[PDB]
Design a binder for this molecule. Sequence first.
Ligand SMILES: Nc1ncnc2c1ncn2[C@@H]1O[C@H](COP(=O)(O)OP(=O)(O)NP(=O)(O)O)[C@@H](O)[C@H]1O
Ligand SMILES: Nc1ncnc2c1ncn2[C@@H]1O[C@H](COP(=O)(O)OP(=O)(O)NP(=O)(O)O)[C@@H](O)[C@H]1O
Ligand SMILES: O=C(C[C@H]1NCCC[C@@H]1O)Cn1cnc2cc(Br)c(Cl)cc2c1=O
Ligand SMILES: O=C(C[C@H]1NCCC[C@@H]1O)Cn1cnc2cc(Br)c(Cl)cc2c1=O
Ligand SMILES: [Zn+2]
Ligand SMILES: [Zn+2]
Lengths: 474, 471
Amino acid sequence: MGITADKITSFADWYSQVIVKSEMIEYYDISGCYILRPWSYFIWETIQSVFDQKIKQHDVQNAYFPIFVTQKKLETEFSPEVAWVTKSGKSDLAEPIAIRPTSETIMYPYFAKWIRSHRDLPLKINQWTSIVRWEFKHPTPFIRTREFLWQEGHTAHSTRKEALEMVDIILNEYASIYEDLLATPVVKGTKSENEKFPGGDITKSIEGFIPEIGRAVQAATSHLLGQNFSKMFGVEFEDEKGNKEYAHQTSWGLTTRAIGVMIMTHGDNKGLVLPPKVAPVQVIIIPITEEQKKICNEVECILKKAGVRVKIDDRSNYTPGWKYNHWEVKGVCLRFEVGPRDIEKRSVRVVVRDNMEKMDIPISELESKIPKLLEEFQNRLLFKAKQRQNESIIRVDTFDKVMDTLNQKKMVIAPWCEDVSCEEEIKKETARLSGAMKSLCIPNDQIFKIEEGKTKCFFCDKLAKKFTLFGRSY
Amino acid sequence: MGITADKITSFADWYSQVIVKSEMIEYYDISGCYILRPWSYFIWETIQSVFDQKIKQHDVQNAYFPIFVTQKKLETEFSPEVAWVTKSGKSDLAEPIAIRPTSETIMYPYFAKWIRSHRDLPLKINQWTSIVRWEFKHPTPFIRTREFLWQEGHTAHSTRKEALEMVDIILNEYASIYEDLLATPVVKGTKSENEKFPGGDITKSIEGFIPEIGRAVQAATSHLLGQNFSKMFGVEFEDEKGNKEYAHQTSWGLTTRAIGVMIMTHGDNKGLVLPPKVAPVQVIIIPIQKKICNEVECILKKAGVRVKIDDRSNYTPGWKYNHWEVKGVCLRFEVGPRDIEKRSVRVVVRDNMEKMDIPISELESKIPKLLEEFQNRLLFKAKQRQNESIIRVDTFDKVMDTLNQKKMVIAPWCEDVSCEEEIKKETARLSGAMKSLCIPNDQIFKIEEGKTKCFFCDKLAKKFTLFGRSY
Ligand SMILES: Nc1ncnc2c1ncn2[C@@H]1O[C@H](COP(=O)(O)OP(=O)(O)NP(=O)(O)O)[C@@H](O)[C@H]1O
Ligand SMILES: Nc1ncnc2c1ncn2[C@@H]1O[C@H](COP(=O)(O)OP(=O)(O)NP(=O)(O)O)[C@@H](O)[C@H]1O
Ligand SMILES: O=C(C[C@H]1NCCC[C@@H]1O)Cn1cnc2cc(Br)c(Cl)cc2c1=O
Ligand SMILES: O=C(C[C@H]1NCCC[C@@H]1O)Cn1cnc2cc(Br)c(Cl)cc2c1=O
Ligand SMILES: [Zn+2]
Ligand SMILES: [Zn+2]
């Protein structure tokens, strides 16, 4: 089978067939829960190892804290989306316990106990875990699940300056995970006061955007918590002159959401298209079997010494047409066809997945040439998704064009006053008129200028502080 | 602070002090749940990566299935020990859902759907996860916890031969994790009918033993499930001539218990002793000059060795010596003026207290080599202690005396279920219970075919079996 829904006009059906026929996902009989079959789980394992290697270079250490937390401890800080354990076997528990929705209330009482002097700082912890949250919005594979996988990092420092720089380091690593690994463009910025994590001072984030349906997605985040939680839990150290001070904290997380943004970004009407740095198989060799079976395996050896993941499909019970569609659906980058005249010429017929480009390549040039085609594919995918991200951002300086452009499926960049009240009104109005539009982020990179004391909010009557990105959110 | 309990006369207090002062573990306020701080989590990560690479050579693929299961699906195949979610926020759920205690009932309905033809076999799946089980027995860190981490492997094959080959391959990799990585001796064998996993036909395992308290522990396990589960869930394939048959299944798992067994095996009255293949830090460099410390260091990183300097002014050399000893660092380098003058390092070796002077010029070559020697020494001594703890008995008479010397018993046995049941009752009354641990693969001792009798029952013995008190 092939894909029978169109990406642009039947997106939901398209996304569903693509993740099921590729064997990325299976649907389960508890709503919002999804099985990650090997084909998608390989992508998560790759993300794990690249990010892990990065944080190790800034001395983050891995640990594992428990999945349960008591209500006493959870209700020190959100509650209707928490799952509670009340029973073991048939008999009621004397008091209920919560499955972990995040680890602050599990971890921080122990930070208080371990930290006594500036010499115990910095303290940098990370754990890879699963998380449960009882979502009220409708679920969607990867993007919004009841159980998801993530890492959560939690640091403590002696100055604000050192904590803020760790916030920024992590935010850059996250951007690199999306751009360099997943070939998915993202926009770095700061969250408005209405949209930030309420238990912290600042929240930075990366935003991405699915152009076929007009919706922004928050792709990862990184908080300067400051002294908010350190006062709340008693996290304090003796400085050099004997004086107790409250530590300056950060936290940050990234989830399997990443995998879904990537699929929705690169996929087409024939199936998955995958970045070669995360594709479980990059090259599949299909012979049209006598001296064929010797040339196939020579080609395999060559690619394997070179570091390329390659398989041969030499099954007798399938048409070459069937095979072509099977590996296309699974997003294999390169497809080598090997028949009689390919043997006769000592060369391989190549078809490139994302563009349908055909090429013949002598065998003695494979060692050099294939690694280099894979680097080109990786760069072409990021370059195209970025151009489409740019086509989707429209500058507006007043309210009158907004609704026209949200209905073309776009994001808005607009000068803005950043007040909470202003944001709440924008929301009410856009909803009424359509569905609501919210602030996504204030981009770190301001490609457009504020004339000092002349430029107005695009909505309120006040003066603008900066330009800000707005749109409808997944 | 150092260790103020004796391993032999105060084992419980000893084990607790060692894992807390080492900074491996922190106690938490829900019983049976323990935090794994980086010093112990590093050892789990190492286990993960070594086992992962091995199973990949036999084509096992990793996946991740959900944590929840419906009571409908769970009660197709152990009731009082499962944890139930009944509420989100303040509102009751329509129906309760179980946190995963094992994954058969989560995985196998999907195996039934994916498997149609012999061309879809073998199917080989592994997942790394956490598990919850509401234990009734008293908890102990690593050994028996409410939440634990593990891998669970689940396979399906078109013949029993191939499924059994896979059971044995896994059992050998588990033996190798304990022996080659953790320097901890284990005994391979087959579980008795009374002790095997009821859902399957055969269960193999490795058993460890802690000589200081006289108790066996089951270290990992591996089942030939045969066709029992395939019939229960409908896992069938068509052969080459169109005939439907039920697939032949295996499963196997290993948990964070491994870390506990290793700790209890090698640790002494000064603290952790760690196999160098899993020590988070292998060499600590302590100065009593700084160009010379950083030189030794560089030499050791190019060589592939995990090394740190402790150059803190506010602590005495004797405080540092204890600190890194408690934490089980293999090799301690002392660098004073005397040492600096001679272009040599004073070395102190953690398990034997042995002292050496090594020239800086010889470090590239000689430190790896010490670390291999230390790794082998640890396994060698634990093996000798395992042998002293195993006594041949041919009748019931010396059994109790032998259990009360903190030992295991190897004995001729008939292998009946009713025989084992009675052995349990009697040894309990008389002390608590002894049960069968395994029937070793390796049968040192010989059966007189026709003449040799059960040591307890009056029937004929099938072969020699290992019995003892279990953790
Ligand atoms: N249900 C979910 N499924 C998958 N990923 C999620 C889910 N909820 C949040 N995420 C991701 O987790 C990252 C950080 O989590 P967190 O900041 O706690 O989320 P949040 O505040 O609830 N934001 P959001 O869930 O997007 O409204 C987010 O930036 C999302 O990319
Ligand atoms: N509570 C626990 N905590 C940690 N590890 C455990 C626990 N229970 C079992 N294990 C380990 O998990 C492995 C797989 O065990 P499993 O198939 O569940 O058998 P079991 O009958 O539950 N074992 P046991 O707890 O010794 O009676 C065993 O070989 C044990 O080493
Ligand atoms: O989860 C967070 C804040 C941060 N925690 C560390 C990892 C990165 C993450 O952004 C915000 N958050 C999000 N969702 C939640 C859902 C529930 Br239910 C609860 Cl109780 C609490 C929360 C809650 O605190
Ligand atoms: O967990 C098992 C059998 C195997 N499952 C796959 C990994 C290896 C493991 O040995 C046996 N077992 C053990 N403990 C259990 C506890 C509960 Br509670 C339940 Cl419901 C079920 C079980 C249960 O089935
Ligand atoms: Zn305004
Ligand atoms: Zn008998």
